């Protein structure tokens, strides 16, 4: 009973480190540095099998990486709170999303590295971005395991809720 | 030259015209063929574009799984090293 | 009368021709236009399989590279493993 999820944002944000932590498999490898993609499958109980893309977003496989946008049932738009320009680079991602994103697929914001505290963004400054865009908000630590399993659990709910509207 | 220049030019023109009218009936069918190629190529374009995630997923599945199995089998023998580095140790 | 009839039959076909020269010229644009589009649909499908061939070599070279490492170190341990069981028998 599958669902397709994908992550989105700059290098250095902490998207490897989030996926690594969400899916607790140490035996799995990391290509994200060598080739520039990774792809994982975590089954979760809601009452459903996830499938998750991650990307260094470089040019070399841009044609394929794009193919993930088209079939992706949820996108996670991710930013660093220790980094200010990552917090601003978000809308150029958002239009980038909906030009490619299949309209009815659902999105979510993410404010990461709450952990590390030379934090530029507040939580309310984060919903200041989230508000306009019509999309749910969460912030997490990838290091300390804060709200990580929620990020994914909340997103998948919204999607199961969406299926049965029609 | 003058009436034969005529009678003859008209005859030349007559065959220039039938050449030209044919090449028109022929370019029209050349286009419809070239159309069929175009549409079919844009179908391929599209088809692949869709099929690709799934295709690529399948490579990753296998790639990860290959390394997982290899990694577990190593690990399992560190566990063996451990257990007998310590079967000796206390003893 | 016939000389005149000829004169203007010439004139008629003269344009009947001129018309085809136009309808050819345009039809040759229209195909080059159609072939433009079909060139693009081939152009990208190549681009794509180029990337997919590129991934498939790379990912798979990379996995085997990592699988070598696993095995490499697994064997190194297996060596120490024997060395230790050979001391378990002495005891
Ligand atoms: N302090 C802190 N560092 C993090 C956190 N998440 C990731 N990082 C670090 O940020 C750096 C880049 O993260 P990475 O996951 O590679 O980012 P990606 O390129 O978007 O996947 C690495 O050095 C991570 O260890 C976090 O929650 N707190």
Q: How would you describe this protein?
A:
- The complex is a heterotrimer, with one copy of chain A (166 residues) and two copies of chain B (91 residues).
- With 166 residues, chain A is α/β, with parallel strands linked by helices.
- Chain A has a single domain (1-166), classed as 3-Layer(aba) Sandwich (Rossmann fold), CATH 3.40.50.300.
- Chain A is built from six helices and six strands.
- Chain A has helices spanning 16-22, 62-71, 84-88, 90-100, 123-133, 148-163; strands spanning 5-8, 37-40, 52-55, 74-80, 106-112, 139-140.
- A six-stranded mixed beta sheet of chain A has the order 2-3-1-4-5-6, sandwiched between helices.
- In chain A, strand 5 (106-112), helix 5 and strand 6 form a beta-alpha-beta unit.
- In chain A, 39% of the residues are buried.
- The longest helix of chain B has 87 residues, at 3-89.
- Chain B is mostly helical.
- Chain B is rod-shaped, with a radius of gyration of 38 Å.
- Chain B has one helix and no strands.
- Chain B is 96% helix and 0% strand.
- The termini of chain B are far apart.
- Chain B has a single domain (1-91), classed as Single alpha-helices involved in coiled-coils or other helix-helix interfaces (Up-down Bundle).
- Chains B and C meet through helix 1 of B and helix 1 of C.
- The complex binds guanosine-5'-diphosphate (GDP).
- Chains B, C: This is Rab guanine nucleotide exchange factor SEC2.
- Chains B, C: It is found in: Bud neck; Bud tip; Cytoplasmic vesicle, Secretory vesicle.
- Chains B, C: Interacts with SEC4. Interacts with YPT32, preferentially in its GTP-bound form.
- Chains B, C: Belongs to the SEC2 family.
- Chains B, C: Residues 2-91 form a coiled coil.
- Chain A: Its main location: membrane.
